[PDB]
């Protein structure tokens, strides 16, 4: 219902998240997918690394700069997954992929915005407990991404500010809840409680 939807892509499955994104972004919703380096994908790590080294073979023989471009970032792996599910060769699919922004880590526009979770793509709800899975950051680093350490140095720097914002907000809600109980006994509250509220 929001104009822009920020999806915290930690612990989401790749092709189960990409189908929901490729349907919503075709229905007309602006979606940004933040923290893409913590995306999960089922199957064991050597299985997914062998699948990516199978993908690395497919290049144009006579001139390699024409061929399938193997992007190595986790945001661009998720973008390849979504672009395979959008009809990206028409104007409708081209206009639908312009409603999408995918980042690794959380950039400062979306540092201070609410993040949502797609429950029909979560690894916790979807995979059997005991199955092996792959993290997209480790897979990207193994296939040749370069900035795993940079988005990990810029992540705990964000997490420090967020965890020191949350302590101030938590103290604010405890100061609100210690004084909001003074009005819950009165006639306005005893009349509001009959309405459910």
């Amino acid at each position: 219902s929001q104009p822009v939807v920020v999806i915290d892509a930690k612990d989401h499955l790749l092709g189960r998240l990409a189908s929901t994104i490729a349907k919503q972004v075709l229905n007309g919703q602006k979606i940004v997918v933040v923290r893409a380096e913590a995306l999960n994908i089922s199957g064991e790590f050597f299985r997914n690394k062998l699948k990516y080294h199978d993908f690395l073979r497919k290049a144009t023989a006579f001139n390699k700069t024409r061929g399938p471009f193997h992007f190595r970032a986790p945001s661009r792996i998720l973008y390849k997954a979504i672009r395979g599910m959008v009809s990206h060769k028409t104007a409708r699919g081209k206009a639908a992929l312009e409603r999408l922004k995918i980042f690794e880590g959380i950039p400062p526009p979306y540092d201070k915005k609410k993040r949502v979770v797609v429950p029909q793509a979560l690894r916790v709800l979807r995979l059997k407990p005991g199955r092996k899975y792959t993290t997209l950051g480790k897979l990207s680093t193994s296939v040749g991404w370069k900035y795993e350490d940079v988005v990990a140095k810029l992540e705990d720097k964000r997490k420090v500010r967020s965890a020191e914002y949350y302590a101030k907000k938590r103290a604010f809600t405890k100061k609100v809840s210690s004084a909001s109980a003074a009005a819950s006994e009165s006639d306005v509250a005893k009349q509001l409680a009959s309405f459910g509220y």
Binding site: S1, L26, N27, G28, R92, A96
Partner: protein, 106 residues
């Protein structure tokens, strides 16, 4: 007080189609808030407007409206079918239409 609306916002999804054949006379509307064909049955027969802009100020204004109505319920998830006087122009695939409550039964 800040709101004034008496409609439910929905999206124009697509034409009624097969695979590889589309029928532009019937559009599919996703009403936001509806999940099943029962309780999609509430909005049957209600008016739909599609409000858009132009540059030729005709009859005193620059915004224009394509009117239509909801006809039946589509498959299993609260999508409905709609028919308009002049059909929707297929660049509005993923654009907000507004479903009014004008023929009411409440």
């Amino acid at each position: 007080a800040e709101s004034h609306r008496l409609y439910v916002k929905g999206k124009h999804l697509s034409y009624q189609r097969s695979k590889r054949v589309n029928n532009p006379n019937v559009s599919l509307i996703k009403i936001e808030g509806v999940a099943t064909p029962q309780d999609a049955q509430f909005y049957l027969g209600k008016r739909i407007a599609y409000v858009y802009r132009a540059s030729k100020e005709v009859r005193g204004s620059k915004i224009r409206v394509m009117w239509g109505k909801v006809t039946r319920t589509h498959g299993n998830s609260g999508v409905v079918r709609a028919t308009f006087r002049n059909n929707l122009p297929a660049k509005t695939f993923g654009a907000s239409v507004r479903i009014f409550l004008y023929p009411s039964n409440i």
